[PDB]
Amino acid sequence: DPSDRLVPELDTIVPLESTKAYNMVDIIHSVVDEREFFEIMPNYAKNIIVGFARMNGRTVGIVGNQPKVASGCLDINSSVKGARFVRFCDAFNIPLITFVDVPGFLPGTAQEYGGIIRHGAKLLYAFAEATVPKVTVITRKAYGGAYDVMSSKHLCGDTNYAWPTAEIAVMGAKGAVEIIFKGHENVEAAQAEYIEKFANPFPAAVRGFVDDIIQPSSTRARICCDLDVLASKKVQRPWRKHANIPL
Amino acid sequence: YDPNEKTFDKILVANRGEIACRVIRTCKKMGIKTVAIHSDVDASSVHVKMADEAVCVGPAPTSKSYLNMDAIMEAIKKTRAQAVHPGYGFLSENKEFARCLAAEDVVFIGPDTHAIQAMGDKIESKLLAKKAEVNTIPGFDGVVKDAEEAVRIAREIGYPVMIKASAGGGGKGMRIAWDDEETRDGFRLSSQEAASSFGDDRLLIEKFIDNPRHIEIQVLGDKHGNALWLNERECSIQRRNQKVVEEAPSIFLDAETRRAMGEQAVALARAVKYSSAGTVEFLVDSKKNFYFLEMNTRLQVEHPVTECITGLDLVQEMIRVAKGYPLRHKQADIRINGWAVECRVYAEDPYKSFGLPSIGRLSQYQEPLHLPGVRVDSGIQPGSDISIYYDPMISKLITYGSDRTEALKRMADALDNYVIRGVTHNIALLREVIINSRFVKGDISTKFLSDVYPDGFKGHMLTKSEKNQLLAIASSLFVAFQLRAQHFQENSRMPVIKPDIANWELSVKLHDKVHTVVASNNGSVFSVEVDGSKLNVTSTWNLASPLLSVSVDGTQRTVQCLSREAGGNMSIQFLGTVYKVNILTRLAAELNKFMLEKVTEDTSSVLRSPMPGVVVAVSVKPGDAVAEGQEICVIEAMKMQNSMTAGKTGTVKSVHCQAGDTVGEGDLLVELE
Amino acid sequence: ATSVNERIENKRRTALLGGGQRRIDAQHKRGKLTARERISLLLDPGSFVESDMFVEHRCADFGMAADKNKFPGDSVVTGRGRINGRLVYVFSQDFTVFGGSLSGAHAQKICKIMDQAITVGAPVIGLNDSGGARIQEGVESLAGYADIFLRNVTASGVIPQISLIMGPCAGGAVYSPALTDFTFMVKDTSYLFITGPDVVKSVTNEDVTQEELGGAKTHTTMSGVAHRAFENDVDALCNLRDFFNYLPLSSQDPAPVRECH
Numbered sequence A: 001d002p003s004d005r006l007v008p009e010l011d012t013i014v015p016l017e018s019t020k021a022y023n024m025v026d027i028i029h030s031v032v033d034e035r036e037f038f039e040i041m042p043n044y045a046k047n048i049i050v051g052f053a054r055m056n057g058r059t060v061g062i063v064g065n066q067p068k069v070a071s072g073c074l075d076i077n078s079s080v081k082g083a084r085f086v087r088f089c090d091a092f093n094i095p096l097i098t099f100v101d102v103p104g105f106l107p108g109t110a111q112e113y114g115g116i117i118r119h120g121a122k123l124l125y126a127f128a129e130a131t132v133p134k135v136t137v138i139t140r141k142a143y144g145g146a147y148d149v150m151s152s153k154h155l156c157g158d159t160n161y162a163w164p165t166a167e168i169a170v171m172g173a174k175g176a177v178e179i180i181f182k183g184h185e186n187v188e189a190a191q192a193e194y195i196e197k198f199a200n201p202f203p204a205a206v207r208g209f210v211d212d213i214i215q216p217s218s219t220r221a222r223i224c225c226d227l228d229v230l231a232s233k234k235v236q237r238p239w240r241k242h243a244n245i246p247l
Numbered sequence B: 001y002d003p004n005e006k007t008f009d010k011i012l013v014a015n016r017g018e019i020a021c022r023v024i025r026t027c028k029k030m031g032i033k034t035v036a037i038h039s040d041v042d043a044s045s046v047h048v049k050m051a052d053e054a055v056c057v058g059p060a061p062t063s064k065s066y067l068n069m070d071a072i073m074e075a076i077k078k079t080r081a082q083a084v085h086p087g088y089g090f091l092s093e094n095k096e097f098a099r100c101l102a103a104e105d106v107v108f109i110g111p112d113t114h115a116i117q118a119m120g121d122k123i124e125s126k127l128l129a130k131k132a133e134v135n136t137i138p139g140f141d142g143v144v145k146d147a148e149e150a151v152r153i154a155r156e157i158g159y160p161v162m163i164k165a166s167a168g169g170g171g172k173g174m175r176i177a178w179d180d181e182e183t184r185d186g187f188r189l190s191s192q193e194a195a196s197s198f199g200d201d202r203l204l205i206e207k208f209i210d211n212p213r214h215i216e217i218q219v220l221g222d223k224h225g226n227a228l229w230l231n232e233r234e235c236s237i238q239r240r241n242q243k244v245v246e247e248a249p250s251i252f253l254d255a256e257t258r259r260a261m262g263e264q265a266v267a268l269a270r271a272v273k274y275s276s277a278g279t280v281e282f283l284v285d286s287k288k289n290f291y292f293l294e295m296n297t298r299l300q301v302e303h304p305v306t307e308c309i310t311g312l313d314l315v316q317e318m319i320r321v322a323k324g325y326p327l328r329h330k331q332a333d334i335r336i337n338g339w340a341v342e343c344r345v346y347a348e349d350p351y352k353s354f355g356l357p358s359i360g361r362l363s364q365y366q367e368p369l370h371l372p373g374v375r376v377d378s379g380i381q382p383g384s385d386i387s388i389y390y391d392p393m394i395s396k397l398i399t400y401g402s403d404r405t406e407a408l409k410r411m412a413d414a415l416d417n418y419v420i421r422g423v424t425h426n427i428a429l430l431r432e433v434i435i436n437s438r439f440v441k442g443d444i445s446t447k448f449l450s451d452v453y454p455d456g457f458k459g460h461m462l463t464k465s466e467k468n469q470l471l472a473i474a475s476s477l478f479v480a481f482q483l484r485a486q487h488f489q490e491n492s493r494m495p496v497i498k499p500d501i502a503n504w505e506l507s508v509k510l511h512d513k514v515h516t517v518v519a520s521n522n523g524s525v526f527s528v529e530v531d532g533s534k535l536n537v538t539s540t541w542n543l544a545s546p547l548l549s550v551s552v553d554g555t556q557r558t559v560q561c562l563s564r565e566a567g568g569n570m571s572i573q574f575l576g577t578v579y580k581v582n583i584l585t586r587l588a589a590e591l592n593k594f595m596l597e598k599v600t601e602d603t604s605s606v607l608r609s610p611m612p613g614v615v616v617a618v619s620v621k622p623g624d625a626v627a628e629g630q631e632i633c634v635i636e637a638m639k640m641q642n643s644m645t646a647g648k649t650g651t652v653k654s655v656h657c658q659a660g661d662t663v664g665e666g667d668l669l670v671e672l673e
Numbered sequence C: 001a002t003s004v005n006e007r008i009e010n011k012r013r014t015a016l017l018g019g020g021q022r023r024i025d026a027q028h029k030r031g032k033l034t035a036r037e038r039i040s041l042l043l044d045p046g047s048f049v050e051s052d053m054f055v056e057h058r059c060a061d062f063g064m065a066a067d068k069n070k071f072p073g074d075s076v077v078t079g080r081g082r083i084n085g086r087l088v089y090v091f092s093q094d095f096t097v098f099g100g101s102l103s104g105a106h107a108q109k110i111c112k113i114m115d116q117a118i119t120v121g122a123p124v125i126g127l128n129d130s131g132g133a134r135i136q137e138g139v140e141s142l143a144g145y146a147d148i149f150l151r152n153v154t155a156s157g158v159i160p161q162i163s164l165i166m167g168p169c170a171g172g173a174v175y176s177p178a179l180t181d182f183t184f185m186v187k188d189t190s191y192l193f194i195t196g197p198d199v200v201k202s203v204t205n206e207d208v209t210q211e212e213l214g215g216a217k218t219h220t221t222m223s224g225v226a227h228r229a230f231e232n233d234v235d236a237l238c239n240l241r242d243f244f245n246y247l248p249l250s251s252q253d254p255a256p257v258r259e260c261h
């Protein structure tokens, strides 16, 4: 399986409408070698996907969002499910590949009463501690602190890519317009300027928060290359017996 | 291909699919700007990207997108396109569209509205053909009064005559009036059926034709009264009154009959004053007697197969004629240069009523363009979606050769090297048809698919040698995968000791039988013993490519590996058919005898609400047709909306759920069988 | 003649007065102090050395470039001090200026203080009172949260980190206290929730107010996020000093030993 094989089927897998959903397992199957993917816990916390695959003959761990189930929102179960897998992959020198499409965290009363903060911190810490090479691709969405929780550039991430249909923002357009343009009480046009200016990956691109905006069909052809360069990564950290996982 | 001559500089192709792509390609060869129309869904189709401009026309359904008068009118007005080409289907045979286009200033590639109006109804066309001194269908013009009229018609023209209820609407029915008492009782039954169906109670009795062959003649004309007949085509192989395999030169006809049919078609076209490309269809009995049946006033779907054997670009000729130029050829200039066979690859499952519509999104798509003498016409690219609103047709495959046998061999080779992963196609049926003994000999009729498979399509039956080759190939591929699994890199800390196993003893389960296989490897050549028979398998053993070419005892074969599991299950496409096998080691097979079978329970009707929510709009009705896993309804929630399908095939019986209801999880929404 | 001497005094008085006397009165009406006197109560008298008192936000979009929206300090007070003679680093969040919303300068100051603390080897105490991330800044607030989280994870297991929730904290800023070793809250004046009650009401169709959505009782009784609850600010700070007396300064040092009787 050549490492430069094109995947044109990814050119239109993301619907234009911001309401429809799609299957991330299809993207994972397209990208990996021989379309083989060993999934871990496939029937528990289905809004997140974790598994093992091979890229150019090298074992890699894959974690990603599933927009089909619960819009891809993070909750208590998926946080620990992803966190333990990421920690195990870190412990044995296995690179990580992440696909990000998340609109935030699942709201409710049971989520707060169950302690969603602790498990969100677990996932955040799991990505922050990781010292193996990691590559991240943003397909459609990344909102609020969930964007940071999913291994943004600022958590010592190595390479980040965003598809032309991706978009990064603090919140939704309606919420930002309401919380900013309150006295003006005119959302007829201000929403139009907001969605034509800040509803695109350009604010993140101009500030260097993403390495480059790549065509989907070349996705695989990029990642392999990065995994060739980052194979010799070495970093230094302050000495300690063991850090305090928020369990 | 001379571009010096003046031609329209703006053409609008108001169509979709592969015909739009072909027209766009021909116009590009002419150096003419192309403008394409597309619905909201088809915003990323092949044709819309191939063209220069692109104008939307409306929503997904064809009744508001490709059949909308106003949308096309404003598209023409904004674009100011010089000429409009409809292709075939949709609005090709619309007289209203025709004169609406032709009124202001727009030229329309096609026949004039007078010819369409003339050949718009069966009765008027039949009487015009009778006035055109051509061999019409043997019968009488009038109405039946009683059984006396039926028996007098039977005694008038021919003994083998139907009593089928004709005229009215459609004119169909399984009826025979061979004998006098048969004429009487069939007339009674046909009158009863007509009263039940249409109420006409009157018949246009027509003579019976045993196992008829459907031939067709391609005709070309201009505004200067010049008519040409471009050989013939045969479209006998049909199911559901739809052609699947077309064969350009007719093996059943000779020079004299061909010339007679061409002369009759040319005379009919001159009588109607046709000035474009058209087709005249004939039914030929066993006695080599041809009778006229219908005339298509548009470009035929299977026009490339007659284009290959003559080298005449039909779209180019249509454009030149519509410009006003006369034909640049004569009757003697037409030659039958070789042989041609065309097949249609649809997105349907041939194991249910010779094809049922299917949906899905293509994940892998590869054409055998590198094979010799293979032409593919398709409007599909990898990642395309096979929706429900349109025809599920995928592609057209054409093979041209020096004779019939070479063309058939090339067609089989192309079918074996054609990759479609994501949906279900009917390639197995096509390959079985093109290798049947009767089809090879040349004895086919419109009932070929009916009598060859009276029970239905069951697959490609395999002989002893083919079964042995399949088992050897599967065992070799399994052993090759196992061997590749042992190749790691150097560790320098714990050295790897590769095992030195000599023989692999395997149990292979196929259909409902178990065979013992012994496999040995000597580099790139495998020696396989199946039940004593010895075979040699050699290949490059490239496990990443979708297609694998192997050589078993010198015979060259091509296979595909659709599925592979650690449990031993393997799905392999061989000779155009998908076979499921289970390969295990001897020890595993021996130990598996103690594994208890798990009995299933409950009913397959499990569809319910995955989570509580509201239904924005339900679009089902008890008794509605259900496709292969088609989207049955939509339940929306926060942010994203869910669209849950009907994966299990079953006729709708009762829809407990209703639109707008806040049904909880587990509630019975749609009952399916 | 140069007007640079008066500029220093004007900036100092603006920093001392925060964002307005009316906002100070509103803060005092709810029974809650301000950041400066919180720090004064927490630390030993005459030992607080404020750093980076002349930092202002550099955003120039959506009218944020106006002088009325430009305040020195960027609504955060950071520095070092001594508790019972032992060094410590402290940062406090000011609800006066845009409700304590975090921006580039806010996160920059917090990151600088935490980096200095991990370099020297001294604990970190964080008084948290903020309405979330600043929407006007945009991705800058998210980047600041990411940097703060990265430095929190890096220093975990190296130096102790204590968080004290003094006001309503919402959004991504909730995650920073959860990554520290200990968390304390003040009864009836502090909240912790990812999303406000309005979003919950809109989405899941349930009515609830802040008190039983992110109150101190919920987190200290049936959520397991906080460790202790205190009645007011003064008692919370005295208990914080008493608790800080227990811990060692860093992982290198052994457990503290005190004079016994």
Ligand SMILES: CCC(=O)SCCNC(=O)CCNC(=O)[C@H](O)C(C)(C)COP(=O)(O)OP(=O)(O)OC[C@H]1O[C@@H](n2cnc3c(N)ncnc32)[C@H](O)[C@@H]1OP(=O)(O)O
Pocket (backbone or CB within 6 Å): A144, A145, A170, A179, C098, C099, C100, C101, C130, C131, C132, C133, C134, C135, C136, C142, C168, C169, C170, C171, C172, C173, C196
């Ligand atoms: C990374 C994820 C994020 O970005 S989370 C950002 C927070 N998201 C929101 O929707 C804001 C919700 N917060 C609030 O409503 C209030 O601040 C809460 C937490 C309820 C405090 O209660 P309360 O005492 O009534 O507030 P207040 O009336 O005193 O308002 C004071 C001023 O603070 C401001 N403020 C607060 N947060 C932000 C923010 N993220 N961005 C910009 N400004 C903020 C408010 O604008 C408010 O202004 P004003 O003085 O009422 O006119």
Ligand SMILES: Nc1ncnc2c1ncn2[C@@H]1O[C@H](COP(=O)(O)OP(=O)(O)O)[C@@H](O)[C@H]1O
Pocket (backbone or CB within 6 Å): B137, B206, B209, B238, B241, B293, B294, B446
């Ligand atoms: N005179 C006939 N006698 C017996 N069968 C006929 C006769 N005419 C048509 N059939 C059948 O009617 C079917 C459809 O007729 P056709 O005129 O071609 O309509 P369509 O344009 O829809 O294909 C053909 O498959 C043909 O086999």
Ligand SMILES: *C(=O)CCCC[C@@H]1SC[C@@H]2NC(=O)N[C@@H]21
Pocket (backbone or CB within 6 Å): A103, A104, A105, A106, A107, A143, A144, A171, A172, A174, A175, B638, B639, C199, C203
């Ligand atoms: C949609 O227009 C945005 C408003 C609803 C927000 C939904 S619900 C809660 C989730 N959190 C978030 O940021 N988006 C999601």
Ligand SMILES: [Mg+2]
Pocket (backbone or CB within 6 Å): B294
């Ligand atoms: Mg017909």
